[PDB]
Amino acid sequence: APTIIDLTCTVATCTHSSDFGGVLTLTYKTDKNGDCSVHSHSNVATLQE
Amino acid sequence: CRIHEISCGAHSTQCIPVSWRCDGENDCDSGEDEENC
Ligand SMILES: [Ca+2]
Known part of the structure; x- marks a missing residue:
């Protein structure tokens, strides 16, 4: 599993709406390509993927 | 590379996991994974 630092x-x-009206970006440094399980720990927002 | 990894051709050192191949997206430098699928 790739490590993230x-x-x-x-x-x-x-823009708070019923749709997914909001986009965020993450910058990181890793060592090998791959996939991760991304999650949001609070109910104030819900992700899509 | 790793046993579960494949390089994007002999001319490139970038390695991607096996599930990356033929996913419908140009994962490699110039989409070598989708080539000849
Ligand atoms: Ca692919």
Whole structure:
């Protein structure tokens, strides 16, 4: 499983609506390509993928 | 590379897992995975 170090989060745009009206981006440094299980730990927001 | 990894051709050192191949997306530098599928 790839390891992730020094990850930061910033939000490009957000608009609270029934649709997924908000996009965020994550920057990180890794060693090999692959896949991860991404999750949000609070119910105030719900992801899509 | 790893046993579960394949390089994007002999001319490139980038390695991607086996499930990356033929997924409908140009994962490699110039989409070598989708080539000849
Ligand atoms: Ca592919």
